[PDB]
Design an enzyme around this catalytic site. Structure first.
Site, short mmCIF file in Angstrom:
data_model
loop_
_atom_site.label_atom_id
_atom_site.label_comp_id
_atom_site.label_asym_id
_atom_site.label_seq_id
_atom_site.Cartn_x
_atom_site.Cartn_y
_atom_site.Cartn_z
N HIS A 41 1.66 9.19 -3.29
CA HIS A 41 2.54 9.17 -4.29
C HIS A 41 3.15 10.32 -4.82
O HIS A 41 4.11 10.58 -5.64
CB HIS A 41 2.17 8.34 -5.67
CG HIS A 41 0.94 8.95 -6.25
ND1 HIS A 41 1.03 10.22 -6.99
CD2 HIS A 41 -0.10 8.62 -6.55
CE1 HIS A 41 -0.20 10.48 -7.36
NE2 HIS A 41 -1.07 9.42 -7.19
N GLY A 143 -2.28 16.05 -13.35
CA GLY A 143 -2.57 17.24 -12.19
C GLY A 143 -3.80 17.05 -11.53
O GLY A 143 -3.90 17.85 -10.84
N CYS A 145 -4.62 14.33 -9.74
CA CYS A 145 -4.82 13.39 -8.73
C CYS A 145 -5.04 14.27 -7.17
O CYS A 145 -4.72 15.15 -7.25
CB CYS A 145 -3.14 12.70 -8.50
SG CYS A 145 -2.76 11.59 -9.85
O1 LIG Z 1 -0.28 3.39 -12.05
C1 LIG Z 1 -0.02 4.34 -11.38
C2 LIG Z 1 -0.14 4.15 -9.58
S1 LIG Z 1 0.02 5.57 -9.18
C3 LIG Z 1 0.69 6.44 -10.09
C4 LIG Z 1 2.07 6.58 -9.26
C5 LIG Z 1 2.74 5.54 -8.75
C6 LIG Z 1 4.07 5.45 -8.28
C7 LIG Z 1 4.83 6.79 -8.20
C8 LIG Z 1 4.00 7.78 -9.07
C9 LIG Z 1 2.94 7.56 -9.73
F1 LIG Z 1 2.27 8.61 -10.35
N1 LIG Z 1 0.49 5.67 -11.70
#
Ligand SMILES: O=C1CS[C@@H](c2ccccc2F)N1
Ligand SMILES: O=C1CS[C@@H](c2ccccc2F)N1
Ligand SMILES: [Cl-]
Ligand code: NA
Ligand code: NA
Lengths: 304, 301
Positions: A41, A143, A145
């Site tokens: 993502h 940040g 992730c």
């Molecule tokens: O609930 C959620 C699923 S992942 C995350 C996300 C998904 C799509 C695009 C950006 C993003 F940060 N937040």
């Protein structure tokens, strides 16, 4: 003596952490040999969260759209592919700090260490368990992730978790390092929510065995239980069912302490019924379920 | 979101741990530039545990009496000396992984990360506070002596603790890296005990702020108090007195949540007097005191 939530030393993972940028988005990637792994993502923009078509977003990117920074050095991306929900960025340089490693998908109840990072720089390390509802109770700010979860039994780092998102109740969801989510979650901004969580019974039992090993017996009683009667009571307290597999896994801790597993199940039944009456166990006023049988054996003495 | 007891990443310290053996005793050492630091009690035998004369035991040792192993490699000891309760072993090779570092002595109530090691191999990291009674509630088995505690403030590791001993209650006692004990303890086998401990009040308040920041608000109330009144409550419940310094330190959290420190102190007073009434705070049924204000800010921001 003593019993603490203990993480694995994080250095082997620290030397793999990098920063990945695409467009305006920056998060963390894991640099192993000549591949950088990160959540896919990272390629989403504002209008993509709800129904992103990742194949369509990715086909529009070239290698130079991805900016990978390891400390102060840029790495050159020379390939990219997508595997389930992780992006794999091929880079021109193999990580000289690559540890012995493998990827392992874990089961609910398993613990691991998390190395929280921001902008590719490690922030802190702590211990987590995979909840029966396939979420983890972590500590993650925006940040974070791409921060990873791992075990290091012997010299091999087993990567088991990559962080992708926070659910509404404040718990966290992510994938294994092959990009398959734990639980039914998706990397989409839809309404999704964690199943009701349950307590990891086999882990509570293991921690009770740890308390006996460190010299504390006050919660024992003269009773035993059948396995099925224990489970009938346990689920009335939102405790996970205890299986014969779990009874077997506890065999060694039982032998060390002299307390049969179903006798320990009888003590847990009573604790659930009575509470703690102002006492503590290994310093906690609640029953702890984020130590596995394996963790207890590693942390505790071999002598009760 | 979320709040976890969190240690510093330990990699910069992992690259400094070595094994030190002297006779039948092996423990851990800290290898920085060309010196290995470890507890001086590594030179005692069984006869020496009850009343060691360390300076006399040292004179009898030669350089070659110290086996220092950096992983799979021997290090060659070319000098040896003592500073307070730590042995300094000059080696022939500077540690190529020496991080930027300082030796610092911490105050009771301050926290630090412990890298627990065995035979010079790091085995786990966890977060600890220096208790008001100068012990730490660690998790150590035989062979953990020489394990160190540290904070990282930028790129700089601040080494603050070296593990020396376990007390009969199962808590732990050690020195700073200059060999001065934390607390009234000695590196000799003698009758020693932890003193009665107290709860670190400023830390409990910080942790209440962490809980509010994380959305746990049930314990807030309309009431405020004064330092004087609150401290009378503190001493009744075996809490450290709260000083004006502590109120200042909590300043940031009180502005971010719009909850004044003495505003919080009324919440804590009510919790001490009446308990939690079956509720939890950040998943705990007791009041946590091993998070500093800095700790909360660093993790919640
Ligand atoms: O609930 C959620 C699923 S992942 C995350 C996300 C998904 C799509 C695009 C950006 C993003 F940060 N937040
Ligand atoms: O209570 C204690 C003090 S330190 C430790 C000790 C004493 C003498 C000799 C060796 C040694 F490890 N145990
Ligand atoms: Cl597993
Ligand atoms: Na070593
Ligand atoms: Na108030």
């Amino acid at each position: 003596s003593g019993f603490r939530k203990m993480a694995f030393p994080s250095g082997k993972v620290e030397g793999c952490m990098v920063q990945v940028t695409c467009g305006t988005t920056t998060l963390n990637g894991l640099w192993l040999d000549d591949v950088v792994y990160c959540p896919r993502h990272v390629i989403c923009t504002s209008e993509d969260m709800l129904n992103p078509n990742y194949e369509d977003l990715l086909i529009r990117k070239s290698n130079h759209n991805f900016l990978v920074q390891a400390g102060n050095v840029q790495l050159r991306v020379i390939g990219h592919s997508m595997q389930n929900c992780v992006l794999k960025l091929k880079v021109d340089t193999a990580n000289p700090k690559t540890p012995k490693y493998k990827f392992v998908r874990i089961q609910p109840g398993q613990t691991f260490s998390v190395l929280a990072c921001y902008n590719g720089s490690p922030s802190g390390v702590y211990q987590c368990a995979m909840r029966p509802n396939f979420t983890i109770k972590g500590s993650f700010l925006n940040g974070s992730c791409g921060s990873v979860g791992f075990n290091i039994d012997y010299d091999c780092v087993s990567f088991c978790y990559m962080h992708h998102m926070e659910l509404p109740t404040g718990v966290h969801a992510g994938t294994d390092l092959e990009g398959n989510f734990y639980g039914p979650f998706v990397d989409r901004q839809t309404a999704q929510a964690a199943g009701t969580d349950t307590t990891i019974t086999v882990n509570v039992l293991a921690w009770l065995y740890a308390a006996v090993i460190n010299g504390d017996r006050w919660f024992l009683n003269r009773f035993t239980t059948t396995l099925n009667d224990f489970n009938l009571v346990a689920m009335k307290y939102n405790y996970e069912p205890l299986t014969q597999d779990h009874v077997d896994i506890l065999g060694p801790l039982s032998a060390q302490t002299g307390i049969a597993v179903l006798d320990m199940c009888a003590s847990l039944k009573e604790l659930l019924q009575n509470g703690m009456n102002g006492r503590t166990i290994l310093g906690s006023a609640l029953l702890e379920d984020e130590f596995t049988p394996f963790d207890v054996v590693r942390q505790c003495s071999g002598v009760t």
